[PDB]
Design a protein around this motif. Structure first.
Motif, PDB file in Angstrom:
ATOM      1  N   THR A   1      30.389  61.835  52.471  1.00 15.67           N
ATOM      2  CA  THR A   1      31.051  61.392  51.255  1.00 15.67           C
ATOM      3  C   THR A   1      30.236  60.433  50.399  1.00 15.67           C
ATOM      4  O   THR A   1      29.527  59.573  50.928  1.00 15.67           O
ATOM      5  CB  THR A   1      32.426  60.699  51.576  1.00 15.67           C
ATOM      6  OG1 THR A   1      33.070  60.379  50.327  1.00 15.67           O
ATOM      7  CG2 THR A   1      32.275  59.423  52.452  1.00 15.67           C
ATOM      8  N   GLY A   2      30.336  60.584  49.084  1.00 13.61           N
ATOM      9  CA  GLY A   2      29.749  59.590  48.209  1.00 13.61           C
ATOM     10  C   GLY A   2      30.586  58.302  48.327  1.00 13.61           C
ATOM     11  O   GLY A   2      31.750  58.305  48.788  1.00 13.61           O
ATOM     12  N   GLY A   3      29.980  57.194  47.902  1.00 16.45           N
ATOM     13  CA  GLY A   3      30.655  55.917  47.904  1.00 16.45           C
ATOM     14  C   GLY A   3      29.635  54.820  47.742  1.00 16.45           C
ATOM     15  O   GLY A   3      28.506  54.971  48.208  1.00 16.45           O
ATOM     16  N   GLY A   4      30.055  53.705  47.160  1.00 18.20           N
ATOM     17  CA  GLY A   4      29.155  52.574  46.991  1.00 18.20           C
ATOM     18  C   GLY A   4      29.610  51.651  45.893  1.00 18.20           C
ATOM     19  O   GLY A   4      30.814  51.466  45.688  1.00 18.20           O
ATOM     20  N   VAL A   5      28.638  51.050  45.223  1.00 19.92           N
ATOM     21  CA  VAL A   5      28.896  50.063  44.173  1.00 19.92           C
ATOM     22  C   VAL A   5      28.155  50.455  42.908  1.00 19.92           C
ATOM     23  O   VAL A   5      26.943  50.636  42.916  1.00 19.92           O
ATOM     24  CB  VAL A   5      28.395  48.654  44.639  1.00 19.92           C
ATOM     25  CG1 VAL A   5      28.721  47.595  43.553  1.00 19.92           C
ATOM     26  CG2 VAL A   5      29.043  48.263  45.982  1.00 19.92           C
ATOM     27  N   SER A   6      28.877  50.606  41.813  1.00 16.58           N
ATOM     28  CA  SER A   6      28.230  51.000  40.564  1.00 16.58           C
ATOM     29  C   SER A   6      27.244  49.963  40.055  1.00 16.58           C
ATOM     30  O   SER A   6      27.444  48.766  40.217  1.00 16.58           O
ATOM     31  CB  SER A   6      29.267  51.256  39.471  1.00 16.58           C
ATOM     32  OG  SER A   6      28.653  51.614  38.239  1.00 16.58           O
ATOM     33  N   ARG A   7      26.168  50.451  39.444  1.00 17.51           N
ATOM     34  CA  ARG A   7      25.147  49.601  38.830  1.00 17.51           C
ATOM     35  C   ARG A   7      25.402  49.542  37.323  1.00 17.51           C
ATOM     36  O   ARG A   7      24.757  48.770  36.624  1.00 17.51           O
ATOM     37  CB  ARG A   7      23.749  50.210  39.056  1.00 17.51           C
ATOM     38  CG  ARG A   7      22.610  49.372  38.489  1.00 17.51           C
ATOM     39  CD  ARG A   7      21.265  50.061  38.642  1.00 17.51           C
ATOM     40  NE  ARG A   7      20.871  50.212  40.040  1.00 17.51           N
ATOM     41  CZ  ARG A   7      19.719  50.742  40.434  1.00 17.51           C
ATOM     42  NH1 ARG A   7      18.843  51.174  39.537  1.00 17.51           N
ATOM     43  NH2 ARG A   7      19.438  50.837  41.727  1.00 17.51           N
ATOM     44  N   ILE A   8      26.354  50.333  36.841  1.00 24.84           N
ATOM     45  CA  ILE A   8      26.669  50.446  35.413  1.00 24.84           C
ATOM     46  C   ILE A   8      28.004  49.875  34.962  1.00 24.84           C
ATOM     47  O   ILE A   8      28.104  49.314  33.875  1.00 24.84           O
ATOM     48  CB  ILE A   8      26.578  51.935  35.006  1.00 24.84           C
ATOM     49  CG1 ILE A   8      25.115  52.374  35.073  1.00 24.84           C
ATOM     50  CG2 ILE A   8      27.203  52.170  33.627  1.00 24.84           C
ATOM     51  CD1 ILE A   8      24.161  51.468  34.295  1.00 24.84           C
ATOM     52  N   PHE A   9      29.034  50.060  35.778  1.00 20.57           N
ATOM     53  CA  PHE A   9      30.350  49.529  35.481  1.00 20.57           C
ATOM     54  C   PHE A   9      30.693  48.266  36.225  1.00 20.57           C
ATOM     55  O   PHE A   9      30.581  48.203  37.444  1.00 20.57           O
ATOM     56  CB  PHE A   9      31.395  50.592  35.788  1.00 20.57           C
ATOM     57  CG  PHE A   9      31.224  51.843  34.982  1.00 20.57           C
ATOM     58  CD1 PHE A   9      30.646  52.967  35.554  1.00 20.57           C
ATOM     59  CD2 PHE A   9      31.595  51.874  33.633  1.00 20.57           C
ATOM     60  CE1 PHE A   9      30.438  54.106  34.786  1.00 20.57           C
ATOM     61  CE2 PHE A   9      31.387  52.998  32.860  1.00 20.57           C
ATOM     62  CZ  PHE A   9      30.803  54.119  33.441  1.00 20.57           C
ATOM     63  N   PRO A  10      31.051  47.211  35.491  1.00 21.02           N
ATOM     64  CA  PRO A  10      31.417  45.961  36.162  1.00 21.02           C
ATOM     65  C   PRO A  10      32.633  46.173  37.075  1.00 21.02           C
ATOM     66  O   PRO A  10      33.396  47.135  36.902  1.00 21.02           O
ATOM     67  CB  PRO A  10      31.793  45.036  35.000  1.00 21.02           C
ATOM     68  CG  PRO A  10      30.967  45.560  33.840  1.00 21.02           C
ATOM     69  CD  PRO A  10      31.031  47.066  34.026  1.00 21.02           C
ATOM     70  N   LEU A  11      32.794  45.275  38.037  1.00 24.56           N
ATOM     71  CA  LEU A  11      33.943  45.314  38.936  1.00 24.56           C
ATOM     72  C   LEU A  11      35.223  45.144  38.096  1.00 24.56           C
ATOM     73  O   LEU A  11      35.377  44.140  37.414  1.00 24.56           O
ATOM     74  CB  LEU A  11      33.808  44.169  39.941  1.00 24.56           C
ATOM     75  CG  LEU A  11      34.947  43.999  40.945  1.00 24.56           C
ATOM     76  CD1 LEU A  11      34.942  45.186  41.908  1.00 24.56           C
ATOM     77  CD2 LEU A  11      34.750  42.710  41.746  1.00 24.56           C
ATOM     78  N   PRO A  12      36.142  46.119  38.125  1.00 25.19           N
ATOM     79  CA  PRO A  12      37.371  46.002  37.334  1.00 25.19           C
ATOM     80  C   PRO A  12      38.265  44.880  37.813  1.00 25.19           C
ATOM     81  O   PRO A  12      38.321  44.572  39.003  1.00 25.19           O
ATOM     82  CB  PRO A  12      38.066  47.349  37.526  1.00 25.19           C
ATOM     83  CG  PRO A  12      36.948  48.270  37.832  1.00 25.19           C
ATOM     84  CD  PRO A  12      36.002  47.488  38.673  1.00 25.19           C
ATOM     85  N   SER A  13      39.019  44.327  36.864  1.00 30.14           N
ATOM     86  CA  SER A  13      39.954  43.252  37.182  1.00 30.14           C
ATOM     87  C   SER A  13      40.914  43.663  38.285  1.00 30.14           C
ATOM     88  O   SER A  13      41.154  42.879  39.216  1.00 30.14           O
ATOM     89  CB  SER A  13      40.738  42.862  35.927  1.00 30.14           C
ATOM     90  OG  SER A  13      41.402  43.976  35.360  1.00 30.14           O
ATOM     91  N   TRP A  14      41.407  44.904  38.225  1.00 29.54           N
ATOM     92  CA  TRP A  14      42.351  45.367  39.227  1.00 29.54           C
ATOM     93  C   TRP A  14      41.732  45.666  40.573  1.00 29.54           C
ATOM     94  O   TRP A  14      42.449  45.939  41.532  1.00 29.54           O
ATOM     95  CB  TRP A  14      43.115  46.606  38.745  1.00 29.54           C
ATOM     96  CG  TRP A  14      42.242  47.688  38.115  1.00 29.54           C
ATOM     97  CD1 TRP A  14      42.037  47.879  36.775  1.00 29.54           C
ATOM     98  CD2 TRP A  14      41.422  48.663  38.795  1.00 29.54           C
ATOM     99  NE1 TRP A  14      41.140  48.906  36.577  1.00 29.54           N
ATOM    100  CE2 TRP A  14      40.749  49.406  37.794  1.00 29.54           C
ATOM    101  CE3 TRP A  14      41.182  48.975  40.147  1.00 29.54           C
ATOM    102  CZ2 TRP A  14      39.843  50.451  38.104  1.00 29.54           C
ATOM    103  CZ3 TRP A  14      40.285  49.998  40.453  1.00 29.54           C
ATOM    104  CH2 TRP A  14      39.626  50.731  39.431  1.00 29.54           C
TER     105      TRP A  14
END
Ligand SMILES: [Ca+2]
Ligand SMILES: [Ca+2]
Lengths: 357, 357
Positions: free
Chosen positions: A217-230
């Motif tokens: 499975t894919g998964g990880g931490v985006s390098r483009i989108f900031p961590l959303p408030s929710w």
């Protein structure tokens, strides 16, 4: 260790999809950038499962049309898997399949066409195509992300497969990568698990990881989108890439994707088994169609709500990792949200109960 | 010692089949993937046993038809054994024999055709064909298993022979194997014993094991199907294969199958003796037809109920093993459920008594 397979109904049963709802009154849009489907396979399949076949229609975007190549190992596998999984589980829903050229503009145009379609009026869009977020032209990422923001504003749920090549997403550049569109904060990112279940219980559910040769499975931490408030209370870790970084965590939820515990489907007349996260977006699109039917109104953008629901709504996956590149176990599943399976697999009836007032 | 043989009526008496019931009003479907029967052997046989011959009809599936080869040692032995055993013991029942090509789709199509047949409307399906569960394409196992789940939902009992080559099921790959369809949790898996009985009592009943050359009952622990909830108190042991996993235990019940204490039958005009677990599914299909006749409604899926019935309903087999590959005695019979004979041989009248409110 023996390979197995399930019909889509078995997986829905394992995830306790709400009974007595079939998606009547809903339209699920499915985006395709190649291949096609044939009516013979779809009719044989739905009949075999004892479900009344959903209406399925094709929509041409930018001159593209429903064109099966006839090869069960080609793109027809994606097209027919998508329709068979979503259709078998929300057979009362209408399914609209949007075909577009395999170009960044075609992908975008298919999404905007489906989202704003006044003839088919979909309430849900399922996407099982994608690529590393950093392999995309920045302008294309911006345009597609805005199209997803627009769908959220319109009350249309957009689901996307998180990837089939682990935490590196098919790139060999010494870094970890998440897939787009799953990385968009406006998309319900669908990861994958290895599910061992029977009609009454889930015996085991772990991260899908069959190594380099079998996918993960894919998964990880985006390098483009900031961590959303929710998503700030999910405990998304910093990126594993040096310099790290906070970013939108992928995926949001996960479901059975391991080909070794895969889906029995009929592709170009051949009964076979297919897996991958490609199956998970249509699986959960059907769940959403059932929930929308019961609520009488579309749930639309679900991410903010999902992350504040009680823990009992999800089956937490805690074992496994989605690393198929090296021995570092980047990333690993664990208690609560993780970058392999997100919130875990939804327990359908509990999710529905939590969404009703 | 000296080889003996019983007529089917003698075995039914040993197992105390309920008297005064003959399956009137019921239809038993019998699946065949080859061979055929001739009215001459059947008429001779039923008349010889003093029972009113049941009506027997053939149903063609995927172009296959009733085609006896004439060789008493060929597939006609299977077809005629099935009809003679079930028909002699439930002569009031109608028998519908479904012939299909010997392919995965043919086997599946025969089962679904019988289960859903609006003309013959069988309440019971008897299957004496099978193969190692892990030698089957996973998609075929999934399709087949779902067809059996469907039958259970519809109130149709499906019985299957557990195998004739012991705990290794005919494979020589260093692993133990159970046979499918017997391994499906939705099928009543029928194992085999060596029965020494007379009209009034059972003198001895042990596991059928005549070594590599004579055959032995199938039985063991599935590598594919998890241990069912209703079977968790049976004390199914961990599998003898590496990892020692938990899985559905085979068989559920057992009956006379040893050719050395076999069934006297007439195959292609020749009076002879035939055994194997092939005889046990039709034997118990007749028992179920009698029970359905008395209850006035079909018992359908019996497995969950059987496993919570009082122990006096079964004759416990405790001696013997079904190992024909080595000296490890895998698996072995013992008190209670075991992977050679399951719950043991049913005591007909007691099972009927337990199923009436
Ligand atoms: Ca987790
Ligand atoms: Ca025993």
């Amino acid at each position: 260790a023996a390979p197995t397979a399930y019909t889509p109904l078995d997986v829905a049963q394992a995830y306790q999809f709400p009974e007595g709802l079939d998606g009547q009154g809903q339209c699920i849009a499915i985006i395709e950038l190649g291949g096609g489907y044939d009516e013979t396979s779809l009719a044989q399949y739905f009949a075999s499962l004892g479900v009344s076949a959903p209406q399925v229609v094709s929509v041409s975007v930018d001159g593209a049309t429903n064109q099966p190549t006839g090869d069960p190992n080609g793109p027809d596998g994606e097209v027919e898997l998508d329709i068979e999984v979503a259709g078998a589980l929300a057979p009362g829903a209408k399914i609209a399949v949007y075909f577009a050229p395999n170009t960044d503009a075609g992908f975008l145009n298919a999404i905007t066409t489906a989202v704003h379609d006044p003839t088919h009026k979909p309430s849900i869009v399922s996407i099982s195509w994608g690529g590393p977020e950093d392999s995309w032209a920045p302008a294309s990422i911006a345009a597609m992300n805005r199209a997803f923001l627009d769908a959220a504003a319109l009350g249309v749920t957009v689901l996307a497969a998180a990837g089939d090549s682990g935490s590196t997403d098919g790139e060999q550049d010494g870094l970890y990568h998440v897939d787009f569109p799953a990385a968009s904060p406006y998309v319900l990112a669908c990861g994958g698990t290895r599910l061992v279940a029977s009609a009454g219980r889930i015996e085991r559910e772990t991260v899908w990881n069959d190594g380099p040769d079998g996918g993960s499975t894919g998964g990880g931490v985006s390098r483009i989108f900031p961590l959303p408030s929710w998503q700030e209370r999910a405990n998304v870790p910093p990126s594993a890439n040096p310099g790290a970084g906070s970013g939108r965590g992928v995926p949001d939820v996960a479901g059975n994707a391991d080909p070794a515990t895969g889906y029995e489907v009929v592709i170009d007349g051949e009964t076979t088994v297919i897996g991958g996260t490609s199956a998970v977006a249509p699986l959960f699109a059907a769940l959403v169609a059932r929930i929308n039917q019961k609520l009488g109104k579309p749930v639309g953008y679900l991410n903010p709500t999902l992350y504040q629901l009680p823990p009992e709504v999800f089956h937490d996956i805690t074992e496994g990792n989605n690393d198929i590149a090296n021995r570092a176990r980047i990333y690993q599943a664990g208690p609560g949200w993780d970058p392999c399976t997100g919130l875990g697999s939804p327990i359908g009836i509990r999710l529905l109960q939590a969404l009703l007032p």
